[PDB]
Design a protein around this ligand. Structure first.
Ligand SMILES: Nc1nc2c(ncn2[C@@H]2O[C@H](COP(=O)(O)OP(=O)(O)O)[C@@H](O)[C@H]2O)c(=O)[nH]1
Length: 330
């Protein structure tokens, strides 16, 4: 590849006693609005480039899986009230009450056969399903269906979270998180959040946000943020990578909700191909120097390890081709 040839032109290692063993460093910022997939990308770097989630590491997330699951079903049940949606079978009302009894007396996320039964019956009720499909009207974890559909597995007494279970978790990130990994002989220093000596920025956008935060919308907030970042002077020589993320969730809701909810002027078809393209153009068009800065856009599913590996391999080649000269040796 051209990236291997390009890096082979460097001579700065020759200036160093032990240059062939020096570490060339890459500083990478992860930016984007809340819930766009930043921490998930961080988890994937650990999985792909460093030690996987040991059986004991996964175990640590067990009560997070329960907590996320409990939160999800509760959001849907409470929404039924505000949106005036009745249960399919009126016996579910007792189960709804029982959900609040059990959650209300517990210390933290937990699972029992009794709770599992309550949640399972609620989740396969037609009215609950009707409310679920109107999730754009309220706030619901994107991993709700993932965990609730797999409730039987999760509820087993000897449950051990799989890697996907962990990637699917929602954990609140406060402050700045710095992770380190080595790939293609590059020592990445990755920061989950404006830094100056930044080699590359990966900006995450939740595509599936286009019909969310009704009461400008989520997608427009993300655009406003990208506009600011992409055009900042501090990032002139910084490679700007755009992850249009949650493409899996987007593909599913596109055939259900029209893009016009977000962009009223959109007149294309409501298909994945045309709507994804349109969003990509909306973001890329925010670049205020279309002759000195290129944006590198990828459609990602951050919870998909193989897709993130493929995409990050491509991002790495962009960095090697464009930024290697400003990357120091240590
Ligand atoms: N289905 C799906 N879920 C995702 C994707 N990316 C992130 N998530 C989930 O979305 C939730 C929030 O993601 P997170 O990485 O914590 O966002 P952050 O606030 O930017 O750090 C988590 O439950 C993730 O598992 C994706 O591409 N597809």
């Amino acid at each position: 590849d051209k990236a291997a040839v390009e890096r082979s032109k460097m001579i700065d290692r020759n200036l160093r006693e032990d240059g062939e063993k020096a570490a060339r460093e890459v500083k990478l910022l992860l930016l984007g609005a809340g819930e766009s997939g930043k921490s998930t990308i961080v988890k994937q770097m650990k999985i792909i480039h460093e030690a996987g989630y040991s059986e004991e590491e996964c175990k640590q997330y067990k009560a997070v899986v329960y907590s996320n699951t409990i939160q999800s079903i509760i959001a849907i049940i409470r929404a039924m009230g505000r949106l005036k949606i009745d249960f399919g079978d009126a016996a579910r009302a007792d189960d709804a009450r029982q959900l609040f009894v059990l959650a209300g007396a517990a210390e933290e996320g937990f699972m029992t056969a009794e709770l599992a039964g309550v949640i399972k019956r609620l989740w396969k009720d037609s009215g609950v399903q009707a409310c679920f499909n109107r999730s754009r009207e309220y706030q619901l974890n994107d991993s709700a269906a993932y965990y609730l559909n797999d409730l039987d597995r999760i509820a087993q007494p000897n449950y051990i979270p799989t890697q996907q279970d962990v990637l699917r978790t929602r954990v609140k990130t406060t402050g700045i998180v710095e992770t380190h990994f080595t790939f293609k002989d590059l020592h990445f220093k990755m920061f989950d959040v404006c830094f100056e000596g930044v080699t590359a920025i990966i900006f995450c956008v939740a595509l599936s946000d286009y019909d969310l935060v009704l009461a400008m919308n989520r997608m427009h907030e993300s655009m406003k943020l990208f506009d600011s970042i992409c055009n900042n002077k501090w990032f002139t020589d910084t490679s700007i990578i755009l992850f249009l993320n949650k493409k899996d969730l987007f593909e599913e809701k596109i055939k259900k909700s029209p893009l016009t909810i977000c962009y009223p002027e959109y007149a294309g078809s409501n298909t994945y191909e045309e709507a994804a393209a349109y969003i990509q153009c909306q973001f890329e068009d925010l670049n205020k120097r279309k002759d000195t800065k290129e944006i590198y856009t990828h459609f990602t599913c951050a919870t998909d390890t193989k897709n993130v590996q493929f995409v990050f391999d491509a991002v790495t080649d962009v960095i090697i081709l464009n930024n290697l000269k400003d990357c120091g040796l240590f």
